[PDB]
Ligand SMILES: O=N[O-]
Ligand SMILES: O=N[O-]
Ligand SMILES: O=N[O-]
């Protein structure tokens with residue numbers, strides 16, 4: 001957790017492997033619930049694989065950490081408030097660290113592909129400070145990332161499901177945000193999932209639908225720590241399957257309508273489905289921002305409507 005100083009952020013591990021430490025540049029937050037961000041350009045231009053993550057966080061002050069891969073970080077320089085954004089392009093989430101929900105490891109043989117022609121060129125670290133009650137001292141919290149240039153037999157990726165058009169009228173008891181897309185790639189295997197909502201979300205659920213049958217991928221209270229939780233049973237999604245997600249929102253407590261957006265007063269319905277694929281079939285990211293089968297949600301399991 002200590003700042004690195006003279007030895008810097010790159011530690012050789014083996015002939016082909018190295019650790020990259022992505023830390024805050026000795027920051028001292030002034031308010032509670034501060035969101036700090038920073039970027040590291042990858043040290044290698046060629047293709048590499050992220051096979052492990054080690055959290056390096058002060059247990060007193062850090063609420064959560066997020067690590068992203070992208071090509072255009074929102075800001076240049078040393079560090080910034082993530083109120084100005086994380087990445088200008090698509091931020092590909094790699095890792096979440098929650099205080100009250102310790103992370104689960106990548107399965108062995110699984111890595112994210114980064115760098116090269118098409119991979120992420122930058123890491124962006126987001127650190128959410130909770131208490132900030134310490135003393136006035138400098139903080140260097142972050143993540144140690146294990147990189148290798150040995151190709152991995154299985155490639156990790158992210159299937160992101162997000163609402164874009166949700167409107168939650170003020171005081172409205174239940175507002176559903178439904179998301180659905182047909183899967184049209186090679187088989188992916190879901191091993192982890194993360195849900196994200198702001199203060200109005202009560203339950204988020206995602207399913208694979210295969211010939212009318214709903215198989216649960218993940219279902220979580222978004223007010224609980226937003227870590228990646230492992231899937232109960234590894235769920236394969238194959239060509240012709242439908243991915244379906246529902247967030248349940250309340251409008252109660254709000255004087256005005258709440259829509260999708262980036263601030264605390266806005267909402268989000270995000271479901272991050274972390275998968276692996278065979279390397280020769282793999283693609284690193286997919287997104288569903290649509291609702292292609294809206295009448296299919298008539299047979300959605302009851303669990304998706306009651307809170308956990
Ligand atoms: O039931 N969707 O294949
Ligand atoms: O992915 N079929 O077990
Ligand atoms: O979750 N704030 O965009």
Ligand SMILES: [Cu+2]
Nearest residue numbers: 063064065128
């Ligand atoms: Cu947090």
Ligand SMILES: [Cu+2]
Nearest residue numbers: 196197198268
């Ligand atoms: Cu959000």
Ligand code: NI
Nearest residue numbers: 189234235236
């Ligand atoms: Ni399988």
